[model samples]
Target chain A: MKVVVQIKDFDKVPQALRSVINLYNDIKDAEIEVVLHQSAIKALLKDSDTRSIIEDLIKKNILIVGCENSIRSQNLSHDQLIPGIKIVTSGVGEIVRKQSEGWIYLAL
Target chain B: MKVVVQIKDFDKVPQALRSVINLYNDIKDAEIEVVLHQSAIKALLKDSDTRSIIEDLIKKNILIVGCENSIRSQNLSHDQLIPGIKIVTSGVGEIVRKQSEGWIYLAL
Candidate 1:
C-alpha cells in the first residue's frame, strides 16, 4: 500500500520514535512517503535523529522527501539535507497528489 | 492496534486534518488515542475544528485527551474543552506511560 506521513514539528521526539520510525519498521516493504515541512524541516540537520534514519528507511522502500518551499522560506541549504533525499516543490501539493492517486495520507 | 498521536503544534492545522482527523477516519475500529499538548491545547476551544470531531471519533472508540499542564500553563480552562474529553496531568508522562505499555506512538 502507498502512504504519506506528514512532519510538521521538530520537538516531538518521542512521537517521532513511535510514529515514523516504527511505521518504517512495520511497513518496510510498502511504499511510504514522508514529507518534512515547517519546523520539521530541521529534521534535515545532519545531527538530528530524523535524518539519522533516512538511509535505512530508504533502503526499506520508504521515500523520504522534504518540502522545497519550506527549505527556501526557512533558508535551509541543500547541503544541510541528507544525501539522496528527494526535494518536492510543495509538500501540500504532493500530499494532494498522493491523496488523489489513492495513496493513504497519514498526517503524523 | 494501539497508537498514540501527538498534537503539539497548533499551527499545523493542515497536518492535523490529515493526520489526527484522518487517522480517526481510517482506524475507526482500532484503538487510537490522541494527546493534545503544547500549542495544540487551543484545539480544545469549542470553536476549533478538532472539537467538532469528538462525538464521531469517540463513537468509533478513539480517545482524545488534553494535557492539564498545558491548560494551566497556557491559561486554558476546562470550560473551553470539548464535552466528554479527558484531561491528563502531564502529557510527557502520559506518552511515556503508553510507550511502556507497548502502545505505538506517532508524533507530528
Candidate 2:
C-alpha cells in the first residue's frame, strides 16, 4: 500500500502529525509520503515542536517533501527548512502523480 | 463565529458532512459554509447518497455552495444539482475571501 498525506494548513499540524504517525504504525510495507505546500509550510520551521516526530519518520525513510515555489513565495529559503524535508518543484505535481499512481490520498 | 468547511474529495462526503454537522451543533450562531470544487464536486451530484444531508443543510440556510467552473468542466449543470445549492464563480475565491475575513477554515 502507498499513501500520500497532504498537509493543507498551519493550524492543522497536530492532525497532520497524528495522521502521519498513525499511517506509519498501522501499515506494513506501505510507502508513505507527506506533501506540504501553501500555508502548510509553516509546519516546516526548523526544530519546531513536532520536529522529533518528523525526524523519526525520516529516519524510517518515510518521505516528507515541501514545495519549492511556496518556499520562495513565503520568503522562506530551502536551507532553512527542517533537516531531511525534501523539496518538490511543485506540490500539486506531486499530488497528481501520486494519485494517478493509485496512492491513497489522505488530505487535511 | 464563521466557519468554512472545504470538501476536497468525493470520498470525503461522510466526513465532510459530519464535520459540518458537528460544527453546526457546536458553535452557536455560527455562519457555516461548505464549498465544493475540483474533484470534490462529485458530492454535489443531485442523487448522491449524501444528497439528503446536504439538502437538509440547505433547508437550514447554512450556505452550501459549488464552483460554477467545476460544474461546467465536470459536465454537471445547475439544474442537475440538488435544489438550493448556490454557485460561486470560483471556489478558491470564496475560500480566500472567507479566510481573509478571519473565518475558520476546515478542510477534509
Candidate 3:
C-alpha cells in the first residue's frame, strides 16, 4: 500500500510516530511517508525526544517529511532539523498531491 | 477537485462542517464528501446541534457519511441518522480508497 501519514500536533508526535511504526511493522512492504507540519515541525528539532524513533523510521525506508511553511512559522531553519527529514513547501499541498497520486492518507 | 473530509471527534463536528462549507463556497464545483466516524457519528443523530449545517451541505451535494462500526458500537440504527447521510462499513477504509482514487483528504 502507498500511504502518507500526517502529523500536525506537537503533543501527538510520539503516538503518531508509534502508529506509523506499527503500520510499518504490520506491512513491511508498504510504502509509507510521514509528513510533519504546523506544530509538528517542532518534533524535527535536534534534541527532540522522538529523535530515535524518527531516525529508526528513516532507517526502515519510511520517508520523514517536514513542511517549510511550518518551519518558517516557527522561525526554524532547515539546518536545525534532524538529518534525513525531507523538506516540502506545504504539508497540506503535499498530502493533496500524494492523494491524487493514489497515496492513502492517515491522520487523526 | 474531489475532496474527502473526515470528522472523528464529536466536539469538532460544527467546526468541521463549517470548514467543509467554506471549501464548498470557495470551490463550488468540487466534489466533497464528509465522513463521520467514532464519536463523530453522534453528530448524525436526530436533533443534533449541527443538523442545519449538515443538511445544508447535503443540499449542496456534499455526501455526509457515517461509519457502520461506530453506529453498532453506539447502538444506533441507520434510521436514527439525519436524513441524507450515507453509510459506510468502515470510515478509514473508505477514506483510503477515496484517496487511492485521487480524492484529496482533509482531517484535523
Candidate 4:
C-alpha cells in the first residue's frame, strides 16, 4: 500500500501527522509521505514547534517533504528546514505524480 | 488520463467547477469526475445556483458524483439532486479507489 498526503497550511501539521500516523499504525507495510507546500513549509522550520513531531515522524520512516517552490516563494532556505525532511521541486507535482503512480492521496 | 476531485463545502462549488472546467478545456481526452460529500451535496440540489454549471459539465461528459452517506446524513433525497449526477456509496472511498487506479486526485 502507498499513501501521499498534501498540506498547504502549517496549522494542519499536527492533525495531518496524526492522521498519517494512524494510517501507518494500522497498515505497517504502507509507504506513506507527507508533502508540505505553501505556508505549510513553515512546519519544517528548525525553530517551529512542529519541527519535533516532524523529526519524530521522519525517524519512523514516514517521509516528510517540503516544496522547493514554496521554500523559494516564502523566502525560506533549505538550511532553515529540519535535517531529515526531503525537498521536492514542486509539492503539487509530487502529489500528482504519486497519485498517477496509484498512491492513495489525502489533504489535511 | 483520469482525474477525481473532492469537495466538502457548498461555497467551493463555483471555484471547483471553474477549476475542473479549465482542466477539461486543456485536456479533452482526460476523464474527469467531481465527488461531492459532506455539506457539498447541497450543490447538487435542484434549485442550487450551481445546477446549471453542473449540468453543463455533465453535458460535456464530466462525471458528477454525490455520496450516499452524505445524502442520508444531510437528510436529503436522491430526487433532490440535479439530473445526470451520479451517486456513490461513499465519497471518500470513491476518491481513494480512483487514486489507487492512477487517477489524478484533487481536493477543491
Candidate 5:
C-alpha cells in the first residue's frame, strides 16, 4: 500500500512524523510518502530533533517531501532543511496527484 | 467559540491531545472539547503520562470525553479511565452534535 500523508501545521507535525515512521516500520513492503506544507516546514528545521527522525526515515527509504512554495514563502534554503528530503513544486498538488494515482490520502 | 477535536487512534492521540491543550491555552475565551473514540481510548489508559497531561487540561475546564460504545466494545471499565474524563454514550455522535451546534470540528 502507498500512503500520502499531508501535514499542515507545526503542532500537527510531530505526531504526523512519528505516525509515518511507525507506519513505514510496520509495513515492510509498503511505500510511505510524507508531504510537509504551510507551517509544517517549521518542524523540519535543520536543527530540530524531529528533522533527524525524518532523516532517519528517509535513510530507511521512506519518501520525505517538502513544499517548494512553502519554502519559498518562508525564505528557506536547502541548508535550512534536513538532508535527504525531496522538494516538490507544490505540496498540495503532489498530494492530489498521488491520490489521483490511487495512493491512499491521509491528513495528519 | 467551541472546538471539537476527534482522536481516532493511539498514534494520533499525543499530538491531538497536545494541540487541544495548546489551543485551550492560546484561546482564553474559547470552549475546547476533546472526544477520544475507537483506538484513541487506549491512549487514555491509566499509567500513561499523557493521561496526566489530559487531566491537567480537564482541571482547567476542558472537556475530556470518551466513547461509551468504544469502552464497551473494547471491554474497558471506568476504573481504567483517568478521573475528570467524562463518558459519553456515543463518541461519534457527540462530535456530530457539537458540529451541528456550530462548534468548529477538527480531526487529529
Candidate 6:
C-alpha cells in the first residue's frame, strides 16, 4: 500500500518519523512517502539530529519531501536542508496530488 | 478565537478532552467546540466514564457533538450516548463548515 504521511507540527515529526521507521521495519516492501509541512520543516533543519535520522530513512528507500513554501515562510534556504530530501513547491498541493493518485493520506 | 477539536481515534479522546478542559481553564472567555466522529464516538458511550467528563464540559456550555453516521456505523443508538450531547448529521461537514466560518480546526 502506498501511504503519504503528512506532518504539520514540529512536535509531531519525531513520532511521525518513528512511525515511518516502524512501518519500514514491519513492511520492508511497502512504498512510503513522508511529506513535511509548516513547523514540521523545522525538524529537518540542516544541523538538527532529525536530519540524520531522515537521511538514514532515505537510504532505506523512503521518499522524504520538504515543503518549499513553508521553508520560504520560515526564511529557510534549500542549503539548510539535509541532502537527498526532495523539495516540493507546495505541501498542500503535493498532498492533494498524492491523494488523487490513490495514496492513502495520514495527517500526523 | 473559536476553535474546533476534531476527534477520530478512540485512544486520542481522553487527551483531546483533557486538552479542551485545559483550553477552557486557560482561556475562560474562549469559545470552543468538540466534535467526535468514527471511533471517537465510542469515547462518549453512555456506560463510559468519559461521558461524565463530556457532560461536565457540556454543563460549562462547551458544545459536544457526535457524528450520526459514525454512531449508526458502530451500531450505537441514541440511548448509548450521554444526555445533552448534540448529534450532527455529518462530522466532516460540520468541520468544514466551522473552518469556512473562520474557526481554527485541530484534529486530535
All candidates' chain B TM-scores are 0.86, 0.92, 0.95, 0.95, 0.91, 0.93
* Interface RMSD, Å, model 6: 11.7
Q: Report the C-alpha displacement of residue B13, candidate 5, in angstroms.
A: 11
Question: Over the stretch B69-100, how does candidate 2's per-residue lDDT look in tens digits?
Answer: 78888898788888778899999899889867
- Residue A45 displacement (Å), model 3: 0.9
Tens digits of per-residue lDDT, candidate 6, B1-108, equal: 576768887866775676566556545465778899999999888887687789889988899999999999999999978888888899989999986786656565
lDDT of 3 at B14: 67
Residue-wise C-alpha lDDT for candidate 3, range A2-86, written one tens digit per residue: 9999897798898999899899989869999888877888999998899998899999999999877779878998888998789
Where is model 4 more than 4 Å wrong at Cα? A4-102
lDDT values for all models: 0.72, 0.76, 0.84, 0.82, 0.77, 0.78
**A27-101 per-residue lDDT for model 4 (tens digits):** 547688889999989888999887777777888888899999999998998988888788999999999999788
**Pairs with steric clashes in candidate 5:** none
Give the TM-score of candidate 2 (chain A).
0.91
For model 1, residues A17-105, the per-residue Cα lDDT tens digits are: 35866776677566788887766777776777755566667776678888776787679899988888898776655664565466776
CA shift at A91, candidate 5, in angstroms?
Answer: 0.5
Which lDDT value does model 3 have at B75?
92
> Number of the top candidate by DockQ?
3
Q: What lDDT score is found at residue A45 in candidate 6?
A: 85
Scored against the true structure, residue A43 in model 1 reaches a CA lDDT of 78
Q: Which regions of candidate 1 are displaced past 4 Å?
A: A1-108, B25-28
Q: Check candidate 1 and list the clashing pairs.
A: A15-B107, A107-B19
TM-score of each: 0.53, 0.53, 0.60, 0.58, 0.55, 0.55
- B77 in model 3: Cα distance from truth in Å? 26
Question: B1-108, model 3: which lDDT tens digit per residue?
Answer: 898888898976765675566567555487988899999999999988988888888999888899999999989988888977789999999988997786788894
lDDT of 5 by residue, A46-97 (tens): 9876867887778888888899999988888888888777899999999999
Q: Which ten residues in a row have the lowest lDDT in candidate 4 chain B?
A: B89-98
